[PDB]
Design a protein around this ligand. Structure first.
Ligand code: SF4
Ligand code: SF4
Ligand code: SF4
Ligand SMILES: [Fe+2]
Ligand SMILES: [Fe+2]
Lengths: 610, 610
């Protein structure tokens, strides 16, 4: 029983829910709203469909914010311990970025010396979680956005002051008998959404400092990245603090495994974000994205799967009980009944990593040799395109103004615009269907493609993160500059039709490049022919990313349809009133083809304004 | 169209929801679970009914925590501004108590200056919102609970370290693909629940400092308390920072109302908690509780209703549009479409209060004289029983050991035990039905009755918060001591059959008295014949109160049935496994009579253990 199966058995899923016409915020419920048939028009409390549809959308964003923030808070606490001599398993693999950061956050570095620079950053970052002054914007946001944007959101009161405080006041204002005005609720949601970005930036930057900002690297994707002769260990989740250490400890045991009868040694494969984290920095091959995370077990060649936080199906234990596979959970706030828990203490990272990998080297000799079945499918992929890497490549075409070439080409027409693919894998859409057709769709129209998360995972497996992939679908105008830069660098040919910018949080990598280009033109993102698209979004996190994408200024496309249609006022606010208030807006459309046209249309419309 | 009407139109409310067998945590949903008919047994993600039922219960608690905490955070920030000279509208009152928090901590007291400590307390309290050390318990909790409890919860990891952080990590661990283990989820819920208490204590104590710890006072309840000769202004919500100032400015504006044609002047009536706040401290009469908050408008004699935060029906504007009544909202995170917004700036409290009251003195001359209709119903009530007041009364019977008499009588049998009534008004139960029958039920069996919130509002209107009320229902044993203390006190006949201990947050007033008695006996609450009951609970806040009531050690009764039955594992954890782990447990029963018997049975069982 797979995810696709379970999905089928759910059919037909509740219509009231899908419409957002249901509310279980209090026990006087569950109240539903009859849109037409003049049945119930209000909740027992008096709440109307507009209110009802609004609070739920908002709480979904807050939850997404809380998911990302918790990822960041973790790394921020790591810096703190580092700048205090603790956690001797983690260092500053890139004092350069650790330095650039300080620069941006107004943190003095001059003759100071690392651990004080590591420490202040930790206090500022952690500050974004403790500030009680509703009017003091979060540091990272105020420091990382075009000054024009900071000025705009600030006047609208859409700039958050505290990540945790934002999630909480969001849940607090949507309690029964609280914030009911549709407009006020949606604005509050846009604000918490900004707290998601803040946490995302905070998390990406500091992550680069701890493990190294990613640079171009070749890798592989899909299940066909599992050695028959190797101990296969999959890492799935979002926190790199564990996976990265595992990759290190893994190599160290390039022997113990061989001993246990592992010819090709230890073969760790990634899944989702944490997988994207190690695939981005190091060569580590990506096994698969969200919906397909169970399929690796069926292979009958997966010794163990180490999971940390979020986007881990609770079904894994069961599916695994059918084989030898071990489902090892690691976080206190992330346990799954059936899995075997091995608390990951960062202060004892390497030590815990070894225990876990050992558990795998053991389960290896317990593997059924006659049940193995590993698809040949092994799509090659070129990943590791951090905002730095991108500017670094543009340097090899103009070391004085790396942005010059990029600016020019968009002005003449070679590059019509840029599409940022972010998002998940919904069952209400074919695995990686929309992603591929939408990418090719716009890439032909001379639109540059950037992708993160599972969306990026899709393109990886699809083979669009390839040099030739560009030579085969990139409309001339685009294909031109694409190959120039690529050649100007160490890759036989052009850049990938799709550039892998990292995990979900790494969407800030895109926000950074965008703001850089935007400042060069002395303009704002709400002016660039920059567009966002989430073809198969599903999670509350995804819903958050999309919301701030819209508040940053980008026209955002969602191909899943959030619980909004049940309310026209709300549907209006987020797809029309947003165009003014904040410049960005949502574009709901479940037809890839239709979406692409609306997207390109927006890119073209943005063009006009320049 | 009233709340009762809207409720009817909702009938029959979804069964899946009621059962907790539905999940809209991500877009791959909404997934529902078919309990029997072997339909869908899992969510498209793999989540099972146990998981599904658990995350929702937890997130409800987190939301409740966020509601209460936000109330506290507000007052804590007020102290901070106070200890800095800003906020020239507010000050202190009753310091002998301000040093009952300025002691309930490593508070540096002795000759240091008040407006210096009304800042240290502010830093500690605010600390409970910023601490990033998962292992450092919140100050107020560690300082206000029996040391035995602190030791117990601490070993179980059920002691929160940061209120806001608790809500957020709660939302984070229940995101799709996160914490799925039923036991782990419920434990995490119990912890966030403790963050609700922390916020509640934090909020009550500091509130007493700012406006005066409540002492016995006589008052009135129910609509009747209104008056055509007066300008009627109702305050509804939870934050006393506004209402209290209004009561002052109200008296002030003398030649302002009478002039406008207001014979009896300005008559401000309360509703819910904020109403309980001013009814507790000052004589301010309570108009009504939750479900009946709209009825005051129909009276046709309500000039205006000033609402701040939470438990304010979104229907008020509409209902009011039929009259002259003004629905004035005041908080940025609490707007209702239709109401007229008047931002309440504390730095300009008195100034804003005057604007609002003026708006009322105006709407007064716009009142329809031929549509007025104010019920005669005006039940008298004796309220203001803070934990202090209770010990103060017990002093007048033994100034050496105020607790002595109280301890003794429970040991001999005069007082079988104590029931704490907390909770709301659900439509799935008659207005204040269960409350009254359950109160009399146990009071006959010699059980002392304490009540807060709307539950307490009920008893107020019912007339059980009366001296004679005791002479008429209190079983001898109880009735005995009840009258002794009452007589010994400077009031009149025996104490009220039901003692009003304040608003929802003031449930800590009860936790305080309980812990005091518990320490005297050198025992824990999980040992006292102390029991909690929420006959008509409805809100996420109520669900939180109940959860920590259970974690503190009390056997808690809920008469609404949270979305739990759909899961036996969960139902088990919170009503059986809790008996061990933490000593308290839930007692779900929708039949007042049946409930009372189980309650008294638990009180009796607790007795046995002593
Ligand atoms: S969304 Fe609401 S109405 Fe639909 S199944 Fe879930 S609880 Fe029931
Ligand atoms: S908050 Fe209002 S609409 Fe939602 S369940 Fe409660 S009564 Fe119904
Ligand atoms: S989290 Fe799981 S059970 Fe809940 S809606 Fe999503 S797929 Fe369904
Ligand atoms: Fe992710
Ligand atoms: Fe309340």
């Amino acid at each position: 029983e797979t995810a696709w199966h379970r999905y089928e058995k759910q059919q037909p899923q509740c219509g009231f829910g899908s419409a957002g016409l249901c509310c279980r915020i209090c026990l006087k419920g569950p109240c539903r709203i009859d849109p037409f048939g003049e049945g119930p028009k209000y909740g027992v409390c008096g709440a109307d469909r507009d209110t009802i549809v609004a609070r739920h959308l908002v709480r979904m964003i807050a939850a997404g914010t809380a998911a990302h923030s918790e990822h960041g808070r973790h790394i921020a606490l790591a810096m703190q311990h580092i700048s205090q001599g603790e956690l001797h398993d983690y260092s500053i693999r890139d004092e350069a970025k650790l330095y650039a950061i300080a620069k941006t956050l107004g943190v003095a570095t001059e003759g100071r010396g690392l651990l004080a620079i590591v420490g202040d950053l930790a206090a500022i970052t952690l500050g974004d979680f403790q500030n009680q002054d509703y009017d003091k914007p979060c540091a990272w946001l105020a420091a990382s956005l075009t000054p024009r944007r900071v000025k705009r959101l600030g006047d609208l009161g859409l700039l958050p002051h505290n990540i945790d405080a934002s999630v909480a006041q969001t849940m607090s204002r949507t309690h029964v008998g609280c914030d009911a005005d549709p407009t006020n609720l949606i604005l509050g949601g846009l604000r918490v959404a900004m707290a998601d970005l803040d946490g995302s930036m905070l998390a990406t930057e500091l992550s680069d400092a701890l493990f190294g900002t990613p640079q171009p690297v070749v890798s592989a994707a899909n299940l066909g990245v599992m050695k028959r002769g190797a101990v296969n260990i999959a890492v799935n989740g979002h926190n790199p603090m564990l996976s990265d250490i595992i990759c290190d400890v893994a190599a160290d045991l390039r022997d113990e495994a061989i001993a246990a009868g592992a010819a090709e040694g230890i073969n760790i494969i990634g899944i989702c974000c944490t997988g994207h984290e190690v695939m981005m920095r190091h060569g580590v091959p990506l096994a698969t994205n969200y919906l397909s995370q169970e399929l690796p077990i069926l292979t009958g060649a997966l010794e163990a799967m180490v999971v940390d936080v979020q986007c881990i199906m609770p079904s894994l234990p069961r599916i695994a009980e059918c084989f030898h596979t071990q489902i090892i959970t690691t976080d206190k706030h992330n346990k799954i009944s059936g899995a075997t828990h091995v608390p990951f203490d960062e202060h004892k990272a390497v030590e815990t990593a070894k225990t876990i990998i050992r558990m795998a080297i053991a389960a290896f000799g317990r593997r059924d040799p006659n049940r193995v079945a590993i698809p040949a499918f092994k799509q090659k992929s070129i990943v590791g395109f951090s905002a730095e890497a991108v500017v670094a490549a543009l340097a090899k075409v103009n070391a004085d103004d790396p942005l010059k070439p990029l600016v020019d080409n968009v002005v003449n027409g070679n590059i019509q615009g840029i599409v940022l693919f972010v998002g998940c894998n919904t069952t209400k859409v074919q695995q990686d269907s929309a992603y591929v057709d939408l990418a090719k769709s716009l890439a032909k129209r001379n639109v540059l493609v950037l992708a993160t998360g599972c969306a990026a995972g899709a393109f990886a497996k699809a083979g669009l993160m390839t040099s030739e992939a560009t030579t085969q679908y990139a409309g001339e105008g685009l294909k031109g500059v694409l190959s120039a830069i690529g050649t100007a660098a160490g890759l036989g040919g052009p850049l990938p039709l799709v550039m892998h910018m990292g995990s979900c949080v790494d969407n800030s990598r895109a926000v950074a490049l965008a703001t850089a280009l935007a400042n060069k033109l002395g303009v704002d993102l709400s002016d660039l022919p920059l567009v966002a698209s989430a073809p198969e979004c599903m999670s509350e996190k995804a819903l958050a990313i999309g919301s701030w994408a819209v508040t940053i200024g980008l026209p955002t496309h969602v191909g899943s349809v959030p619980p909004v249609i049940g309310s026209q006022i709300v549907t209006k606010l987020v797809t029309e009133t947003a165009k003014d208030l904040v410049g960005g807006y949502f574009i709901v459309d479940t037809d890839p083809k239709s979406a692409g046209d609306k997207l390109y249309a927006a890119i073209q419309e943005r063009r006009a304004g320049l």
